[PDB]
Amino acid sequence: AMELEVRRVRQAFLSGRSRPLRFRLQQLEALRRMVQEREKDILTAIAADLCKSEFNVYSQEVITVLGEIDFMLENLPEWVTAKPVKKNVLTMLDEAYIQPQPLGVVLIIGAWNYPFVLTIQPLIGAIAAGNAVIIKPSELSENTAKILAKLLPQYLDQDLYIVINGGVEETTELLKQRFDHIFYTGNTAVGKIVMEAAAKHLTPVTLELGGKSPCYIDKDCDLDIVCRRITWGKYMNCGQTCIAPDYILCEASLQNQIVWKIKETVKEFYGENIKESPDYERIINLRHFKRILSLLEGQKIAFGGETDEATRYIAPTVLTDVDPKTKVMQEEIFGPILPIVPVKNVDEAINFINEREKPLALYVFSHNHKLIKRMIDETSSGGVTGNDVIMHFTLNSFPFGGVGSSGMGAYHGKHSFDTFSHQRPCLLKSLKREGANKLRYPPNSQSKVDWGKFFLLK
Amino acid sequence: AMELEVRRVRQAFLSGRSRPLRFRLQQLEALRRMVQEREKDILTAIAADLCKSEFNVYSQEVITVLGEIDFMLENLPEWVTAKPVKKNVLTMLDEAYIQPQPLGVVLIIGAWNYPFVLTIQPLIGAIAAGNAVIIKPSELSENTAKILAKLLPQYLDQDLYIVINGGVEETTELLKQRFDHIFYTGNTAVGKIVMEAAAKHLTPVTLELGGKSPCYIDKDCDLDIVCRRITWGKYMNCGQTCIAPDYILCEASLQNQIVWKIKETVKEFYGENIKESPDYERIINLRHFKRILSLLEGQKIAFGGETDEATRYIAPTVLTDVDPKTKVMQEEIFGPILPIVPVKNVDEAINFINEREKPLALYVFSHNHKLIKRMIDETSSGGVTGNDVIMHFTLNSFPFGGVGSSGMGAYHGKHSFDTFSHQRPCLLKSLKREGANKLRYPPNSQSKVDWGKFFLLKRFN
C-alpha cells in the first residue's frame, strides 16, 4: 500500500510533465488559488487543532504561505536557467555552466505546531524545483491533516503531489520506500530514525529539529522594549515553537524588572483574565500538557503557573533563579514557561550555551555591539536575532535551518529550491583543438610536467 | 583508543585556535611547504602504491593539490567575511548578514586510487573553514597512508589535524565517535555504513561514491578525436577512477572503427610493448585484479585481454557487442576494460541510462549540440562533459559530487569551504520603533489582519 503510492508518484515524475517551468508555475498558481478560495476551511481546521483564533492563524500561517508562493512565482524563471561559471586555463574556450534539476520524489514529513506552514512551505520549494511530492502531515494536528488530504487533489496535479495520512506505524512503513529526498521537521530522536531510514537508500535529508533557544539579556539596554519582544515570541502559540526563546540568561539582579515587565506585557497582550483571551492558545494534547506540568514541580514561580487539564490550559509563566540541572532546563520546554538562569556576565553565558547542544536559534539583547559580535562569533546556532526574537525567520534571503542537534540543511526561498534540486555542472567542449591535448596525453615527460608547473601554478 | 584521539582533536578545536583567518592561512602555507619540501617522498609513496611514474603522480595528484592550496590562499580572506543579504519591508532598517563558521571536528575517509588527492584536497577545504580534522587514509594505499602519518605532524598543528591509520575494524570504532561532519569517498555499500553511523549522532555527510559512468558516441562526430579522448580517460590509472568512462553506448556499425582507433591510440600512448611503458599503472591488489579478470569470462575480446597475476597487469581491453546482463555491465569496472553496448539511437541510450542508477559522470560525444543538450535534460548525473572525458573535474568553479547512488554533497574550491562550514544568518535590530510592532502583537483584530493583507501581501484593494 505505501509501496503503491510511491510507485504512482514516481511514475508521474518519470513522465516528465513537472519538468517545464510553465507547469511548475501553474501548480504554484493553483496552490495560491486553493489558499484564497478555501481560506475559511483552512483557518477553521488549524484553529481547531491548536485552539487558536482565525486572526492568528491568518497572520502567522497564511500570510507566510502566501508570501512564499509570490516569491517563488516571481523568481523561479530565473532560478531554473543554466548559470555560466568562471573557467580556467584548460577550459577558457569551452561552454561551462551549472544547471539545476529535480531530485525526483520528495517526502515531506510535517510537524503539528504550525501544521500548514510546515507542510506547505516546503512543498512550495519542492514543487518549484520540479519534483513530485508526498506530504505526510502530523497526526497530532488532525483537522489540518484531513483538510490537506481533501483540498490538494482539488487544485494540484493528483498524481505528482499527494497526501498520505497516518501515525508512527504508517510513517515507518512509508520510510521503507525509496525517495530522492526526505524533509523532516520535528524532534531529535525521530530525526535519527529518519536519517537511519534514509541511510538504507542513500537518500539526502533535511532535518529541522529543535533544542533550547537561549535568550541573553545584557544590562546595557531598555528592558521595557526587550521584555515586550520576548513576551511576544515566548507566548505565541503557547510557546510551542522551535524558534521561541526557551530560556533567559542574565545577571541575577535583572530578574525582578524582567519578571515585572513580562507580567505587565502579558496583561496588555492577553488581558486580566488570560483564559478568556482569544489570543492565547492551548497545549496540543494531554501527553504534552502533563509533560509541561511536570517541569513546574520544585520550581520557584514568579508568576503564572495556573493550569487546567480539561482545556489543556497553562498560563504564561516565568521562573526565577533556576538551577540548570532541573527538568525545565534539561529538555525543550515547548510550552508557556520561561526560566531565568542567572549568569554573572557574557563569558559565563557563552560557556553555558557552548556546553549544550547547538540550538536552532540564539537571541541576544544589548546596545553594545561588540558584546553581540562576541556572542555570535563564539557560539554556534541555526540563526541569530539581535534585539528581537523570531524575525530572522521572515527573511527569504536567509537559509532557515539548524546545525548539530538542531538539524542539517536549510530552506526558504531560493534555499528551498536548491535543497530540492541537484545543481548539475556541465562542461561542453568541441571536437576541435585536439593537438593541444597532447600535453595531457601519455607518454609523460619532464617537458609536459614543466608545462603544468608554468601554466597551472603561481 | 579512538575515543581518546577524537577527544584530543575536539579539545584543540574548542581552544579557538583555528578560528582566526591568520591561523588558517598559516596552516595552508605550512601544507604547501610540506608538499614542496617533501615532494620526492610524496611521489615515491604514491608511485609505489599504484606502480605509477613520478611524472604521472606529479601531474595528476600533486599539481591538483597545489592548485587547490593556491586557490584557497587567495580567496579565503573574502570567504570568511560576513555577507550582507537582501532585506524585506519589516527588516529594511536593520542589519542582516550570513556569516560562515566551522562545523567542529571533521572526519575524512580517503580512497586508495588517488590517495593523496582524495585525502588532502578535502583537508584543504576543512582547514580553510576553521575545522579540526581527522584523516583516515585507505589501508589499500599503504605507502601513502604511512607518509601522511609521518609528514603531517611535522608541518601542521599536531592536535588540530591528525592521521589515524587502520582498516575496517578501526574504521568501525572510529565511526562510533562523534564528529561534526563526515566526508567519505568510496563505494555505495560502505557509504550506507558511513551514513548509518552518522545517523547515530545527526552528523551531516558528504559521500562521493561511484557507478558506471556512461559514454555515448553519436555517429555524427570525428571518431579519431573521440577515441583519443576516451582512450586517455579510460586507461589513466588503469581505469581505476570514479569518473573514468565505464562503458560505451553507440550504434553497432561504429564498433569496428572505435576498436581500430582505440588500438592505434593505445600504441601511441603506451608503445608496442605496453608492459614496459612507464605511463601505464597496475591494479591495486590481487583481490581487484581477480575481480577484474572475472569480468572477461564469456566476453568477445576485440582488443587486449593479456593479464599477468604476478605484476597485477591487465592490458587495455575492449569488448564488443556486450550483453548488458553480463557481469561486466552489472558492476563498476574500475579497471582497464571498456565494454561497448550497441544502441540503435539516442532514445535507446537515454532509456538505458535512466533505467540504471545515477552515475557520477556522463560523457556525450557529438557534433550536434541539440542532441548533447537533449541527453543532459533527459538524464541525471553528478556531472557532465560533452566531447571530452574527466575535464569537468578540473574547474574550481564546479561543485564536484554525485547524485542518488553516486553520492550526496559536493566539494572543490568554494564548495569545499561551504561543505565544511555552517552559513549562519544574523539579523541585528535596534530597540527603536517599538510602537510599530503593535501590528504583530496581540491582541489580534480584524483591523490588524486587514492591514497585513493590504501592506504585507500588497493587496490594494
Swiss-Prot record, chain A:
Protein name: Aldehyde dehydrogenase family 3 member A2
Membrane-topology descriptor: Single-pass membrane protein
Presence of keyword Lipid metabolism: yes
Function: Catalyzes the oxidation of medium and long chain aliphatic aldehydes to fatty acids. Active on a variety of saturated and unsaturated aliphatic aldehydes between 6 and 24 carbons in length. Responsible for conversion of the sphingosine 1-phosphate (S1P) degradation product hexadecenal to hexadecenoic acid.
pH dependence: Optimum pH is 9.8.
Coarse class of the protein's main subcellular location: membrane
Effect of mutating residue 185 to R: In SLS; severe loss of activity
Side Cytoplasmic, residues: 2-458
Distribution of this protein across tissues and organs: Detected in liver (at protein level).
Similarity section: Belongs to the aldehyde dehydrogenase family.
Organism from which the protein derives: Homo sapiens (Human)
Subcellular location: Microsome membrane; Endoplasmic reticulum membrane
Quaternary structure and partners: Homodimer.
Linked pathology: Sjoegren-Larsson syndrome: An autosomal recessive neurocutaneous disorder characterized by a combination of severe intellectual disability, spastic di- or tetraplegia and congenital ichthyosis. Ichthyosis is usually evident at birth with varying degrees of erythema and scaling, neurologic symptoms appear in the first or second year of life. Most patients have an IQ of less than 60. Additional clinical features include glistening white spots on the retina, seizures, short stature and speech defects.
Top-level taxon: Eukaryota
Catalytic center residues: 208, 242
Pfam assignment, any one: Aldedh
Signal peptide bounds: none
